[PDB]
User: Fold this.
Amino acid sequence: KRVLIKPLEPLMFRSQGEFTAAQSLIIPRPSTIAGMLGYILFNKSSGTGDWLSDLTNLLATIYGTFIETNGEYLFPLRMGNHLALVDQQHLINLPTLLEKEYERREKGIYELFYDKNKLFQIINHQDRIGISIDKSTRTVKEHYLYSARYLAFKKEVNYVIFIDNDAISDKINGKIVNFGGENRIAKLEVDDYKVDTSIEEEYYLALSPILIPDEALDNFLDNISDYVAMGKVDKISLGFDIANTKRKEMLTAILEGSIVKRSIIDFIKNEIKNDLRYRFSKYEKIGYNTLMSLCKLALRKILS
RNA sequence: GUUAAGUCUGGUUUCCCUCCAGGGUAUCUAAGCUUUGAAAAAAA
Assistant:
């Protein structure tokens, strides 16, 4: 039902190329969680060139990711190039604060992203530099000096997701998994948890990157205010497929932690023919289009 | 009255240091060197 991913050690979720150190994301993308879960549930017989088909077959609908620090729940929130983790008690008045007056707008939002921001109390950015040594000289092998900015945790942190199917939630319990990038470790634990679904509010929080079908890109973009009140829109890669050893895709997405307006739902519902409808239904199945209500902890997918 | 004979004794006691000063002043580190040379982007 509810799955807590507890990182045993600093993590690495590489983003935006490798070219001082390569930076890590705060919240891992849903493709990473889906890939770890499929890695657990894998069987070496269902192979197909469609990574997400073989991945949707291995599991069920996964709901987006947030932070459980110590009983508290933190949620991503971005204003544009400004990520933060806030407890939902500060998301309540947010829509009121959105089309509130100007100076009150900046007062409130910059009090949220700076003092109410619980990111740095939780997250440290730990640069790690490694090298490679040739086994006969015992001096650094030439050209092998790499760096990466890992995501260290000051206090114990969990990533929270919700999975619908309860059959896999038995062979997922207590598994030690290779969560993330350069061979780091996290533990999964499964617990029964109660979460509402599909509330009809006006302002939702993108818990996961809301994908855009690359057909309504111009449509969605040239009038952007109609769908997102605050957040970031960026072209993101969908990761790396283990089977064929390639990058996955690139799609414009509404980065997790954005504030979406109810209209976006109907918009996405009107711009998908059967083909890409099935495609993006799969995408949502593995966990991309997850919304939460600023009211309370109540999730819903956009299409499903 | 006369005689005759001298004998004993030959430095003792006390005090043997007391009081003040028991180190003072100056110097309390100085000038250098504060990283250098190899490895910056590698094959699948």
In short: Residues 17 and 104 of chain A are 38 Å apart (CA to CA). Residues 18-20, 131-132, 139-147, 245 of chain A lie near RNA strand B (CB under 10 Å from a C1').
